[PDB]
Amino acid sequence: DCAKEGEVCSWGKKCCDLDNFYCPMEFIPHCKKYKPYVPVTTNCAKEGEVCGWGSKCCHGLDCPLAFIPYCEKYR
Amino acid sequence: DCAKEGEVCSWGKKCCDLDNFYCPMEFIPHCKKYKPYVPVTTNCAKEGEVCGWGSKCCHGLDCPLAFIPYCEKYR
Amino acid sequence: VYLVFLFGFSTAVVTLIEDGKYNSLYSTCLELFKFTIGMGDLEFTENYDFKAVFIILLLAYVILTYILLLNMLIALMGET
Amino acid sequence: KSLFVDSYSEILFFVQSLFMLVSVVLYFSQRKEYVASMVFSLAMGWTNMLYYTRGFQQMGIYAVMIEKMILRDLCRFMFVYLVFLFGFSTAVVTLIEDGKYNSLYSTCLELFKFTIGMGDLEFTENYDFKAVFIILLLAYVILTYILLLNMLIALMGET
Amino acid sequence: KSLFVDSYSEILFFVQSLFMLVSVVLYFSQRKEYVASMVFSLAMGWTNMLYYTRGFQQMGIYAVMIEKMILRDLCRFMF
Numbered sequence: 001d002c003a004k005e006g007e008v009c010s011w012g013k014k015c016c017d018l019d020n021f022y023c024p025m026e027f028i029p030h031c032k033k034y035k036p037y038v039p040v041t042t043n044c045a046k047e048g049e050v051c052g053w054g055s056k057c058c059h060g061l062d063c064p065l066a067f068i069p070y071c072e073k074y075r
Numbered sequence: 076d077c078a079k080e081g082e083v084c085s086w087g088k089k090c091c092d093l094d095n096f097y098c099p100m101e102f103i104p105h106c107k108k109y110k111p112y113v114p115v116t117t118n119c120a121k122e123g124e125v126c127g128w129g130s131k132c133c134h135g136l137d138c139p140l141a142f143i144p145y146c147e148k149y150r
Numbered sequence: 151v152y153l154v155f156l157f158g159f160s161t162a163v164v165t166l167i168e169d170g171k172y173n174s175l176y177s178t179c180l181e182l183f184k185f186t187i188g189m190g191d192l193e194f195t196e197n198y199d200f201k202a203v204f205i206i207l208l209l210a211y212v213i214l215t216y217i218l219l220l221n222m223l224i225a226l227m228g229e230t
Numbered sequence: 231k232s233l234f235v236d237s238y239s240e241i242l243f244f245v246q247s248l249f250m251l252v253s254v255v256l257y258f259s260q261r262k263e264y265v266a267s268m269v270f271s272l273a274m275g276w277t278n279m280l281y282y283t284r285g286f287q288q289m290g291i292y293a294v295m296i297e298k299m300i301l302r303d304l305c306r307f308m309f310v311y312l313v314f315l316f317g318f319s320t321a322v323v324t325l326i327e328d329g330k331y332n333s334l335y336s337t338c339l340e341l342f343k344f345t346i347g348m349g350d351l352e353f354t355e356n357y358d359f360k361a362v363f364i365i366l367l368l369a370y371v372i373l374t375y376i377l378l379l380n381m382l383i384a385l386m387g388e389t
Numbered sequence: 390k391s392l393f394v395d396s397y398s399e400i401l402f403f404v405q406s407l408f409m410l411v412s413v414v415l416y417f418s419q420r421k422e423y424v425a426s427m428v429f430s431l432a433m434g435w436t437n438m439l440y441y442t443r444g445f446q447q448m449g450i451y452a453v454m455i456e457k458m459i460l461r462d463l464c465r466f467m468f
């Protein structure tokens with residue numbers, strides 16, 4: 001049968017229902033429940049600010065690939 | 076402007092709308108129209124018959140990866 | 151020598167994982183051959199039963215074939 | 231010291247036998263882990279076919295050359311390679327605590343993939359310290375892939 | 390002359406120390422950038438383990454060969 005949360009997985013035994021639980025990659029992994037998607041909020045960088053060097057950007061922007069990238073609206 | 080069907084593409088000029096366009100990979104390509112799609116008609120192989128060696132299965136079936144494969148009702 | 155190593159690790163992998171692209175010797179032999187020419191598929195997105203034993207076999211195979219034997223072939227051609 | 235330096239084939243055949251016996255013990259103890267033992271016997275059992283390459287001169291000399299490549303060249307390579315891998319792995323895990331890089335094991339695998347030519351220099355994810363990550367990965371790739379891995383081929387040629 | 394032609398290991402240990410001090414300065418100034426200075430000092434540190442390969446003959450000669458490979462061959466190829 002399947003392994004429940006908190007039990008050792010992948011040594012000949014899968015986790016239970018995979019919409020709710022997963023087996024991580026850690027060489028003796030234990031089944032863990034998923035976690036929700038918390039949205040990004042303050043402490044992010046805003047539009048026109050230096051992204052990448054220690055501060056990500058909020059939802060409505062993209063941080064380009066450049067040496068000193070600035071977040072911008074992507075259309 | 077864009078190039079119409081039959082004109083030479085990719086030498087500094089894209090063709091017009093994607094619904095009737097594909098610039099082939101031919102080193103002097105011409106804009107061509109997407110043909111309609113027909114499913115696998117007759118002359119296919121049937122389930123339990125040999126596939127791969129000059130005959131392909133019909134759309135309800137699939138040909139596995141083996142030296143002498145046979146059409147199977149996949150899933 | 152290469153075919154001896156290939157068939158050995160192929161049989162082991164097929165025995166370990168009976169399903170999901172490794173349900174035959176032909177498929178598993180091809181998938182392990184792809185590692186030799188540098189286009190392997192080390193994704194590990196699948197939920198196999200004996201993962202973390204699978205990984206040890208693949209790492210051992212890769213070290214034996216890719217790093218050791220191929221560079222040895224280059225050395226021997228240079229000697230010839 | 232004699233076993234540590236000589237009679238390797240006896241050790242390998244013995245270890246194959248040990249894996250088989252442990253597999254039988256786990257079989258009759260009503261465990262599923264016996265398969266994990268069994269395959270380690272099987273994968274060894276084919277490689278020990280090379281023992282029989284003696285008795286044919288060309289293949290025998292080839293096998294002896296394999297033996298000296300393993301002991302003299304590969305053993306020195308792997309020590310330095312593991313030191314560099316572990317160093318950059320710890321740095322990357324410290325920098326980026328989330329998503330393929332939240333453990334030493336996952337990060338070690340993802341860095342190991344670069345050496346065998348199936349890396350992942352994508353940088354599509356939204357990390358806090360992107361653009362430092364790129365510098366670390368470029369340094370790692372230059373040090374391992376270009377310098378050390380070709381140096382191994384040169385040393386094998388000399389040997 | 391000897392600051393670049395010779396005595397590499399003294400320079401590399403010194404540069405590791407400089408990265409550590411810059412990390413401390415950034416730490417107490419309320420800047421997250423102190424992480425960036427930290428990890429470089431970590432990544433250099435595990436590389437400076439090769440300094441101790443002397444005292445073992447085979448690894449010592451191997452490390453000297455690595456030094457010469459960097460300074461002779463790689464520095465033209467990269468150009």
Ligand SMILES: CCCCCCCCCCCCC(=O)O[C@@H](COC(=O)CCC)COP(=O)(O)O[C@H]1[C@H](O)[C@@H](O)[C@@H](O)[C@@H](O)[C@@H]1O
Pocket residue numbers: 210235236237238239240242270273274277278280281293296297300
């Ligand atoms: C998951 C599993 C994968 C692991 C597979 C690992 C590779 C197996 C490769 C197949 C090896 C079989 C074999 O052919 O055995 C090899 C030993 O394996 C190795 O090379 C290193 C193993 C590390 C030769 O051993 P040999 O008995 O010939 O030793 C010699 C004496 O006989 C002789 O009298 C002289 O004293 C001479 O100096 C001695 O050396």
Ligand SMILES: CCCCCCCCCCCCC(=O)O[C@@H](COC(=O)CCC)COP(=O)(O)O[C@H]1[C@H](O)[C@@H](O)[C@@H](O)[C@@H](O)[C@@H]1O
Pocket residue numbers: 369394395396397398399401429432433436437439440455456459
């Ligand atoms: C995140 C970014 C990491 C960058 C890391 C870059 C690789 C470091 C590799 C490990 C370096 C440790 C080491 O051990 O450094 C090596 C050399 O460094 C290099 O490989 C190139 C550095 C540039 C030995 O330095 P050494 O002090 O012994 O110099 C020798 C004198 O002792 C002796 O008297 C002789 O006169 C001799 O001619 C001198 O050379």
Ligand SMILES: CCCCCCCCCCC(=O)O[C@H](COC(=O)CCCCC)COP(=O)(O)OCCN
Pocket residue numbers: 025026027028209213332333334335338339342
């Ligand atoms: C030859 C080619 C090698 C390439 C692969 C290298 C993988 C080594 C993993 C290093 C490691 O550091 O592995 C950690 C320690 O365990 C071991 O793995 C012991 C066996 C390792 C024996 C050296 C993983 O443990 P963890 O619980 O997942 O730590 C995560 C904390 N949250």
Ligand SMILES: CCCCCCCCCCC(=O)O[C@H](COC(=O)CCCCC)COP(=O)(O)OCCN
Pocket residue numbers: 065066067068368
């Ligand atoms: C060893 C292997 C090397 C592979 C990676 C090479 C990347 C080099 C980029 C070259 C460059 O020329 O980089 C441009 C100039 O700036 C710098 O980056 C200076 C610092 C660079 C120090 C040399 C990028 O600037 P940008 O603003 O993003 O240009 C976009 C304009 N809209």
Ligand SMILES: CCCCCCCCCCC(=O)O[C@H](COC(=O)CCCCC)COP(=O)(O)OCCN
Pocket residue numbers: 101102103
């Ligand atoms: C160094 C790495 C090489 C890899 C790429 C090789 C490309 C050559 C293709 C050969 C060919 O067969 O190319 C034919 C002619 O094109 C040319 O190529 C001309 C130049 C040939 C002179 C060398 C194909 O004819 P087509 O009109 O382009 O396509 C219609 C077909 N029904």
Ligand SMILES: CCCCCCCCCCC(=O)O[C@H](COC(=O)CCCCC)COP(=O)(O)OCCN
Pocket residue numbers: 140141142143173174175176179180183
């Ligand atoms: C040089 C590089 C080689 C890389 C590719 C090697 C692929 C060969 C696979 C070997 C094998 O062992 O192939 C099996 C036996 O058949 C043959 O293929 C005979 C011809 C083989 C001649 C020796 C596959 O048969 P199957 O029916 O699909 O078995 C699955 C049962 N469900």
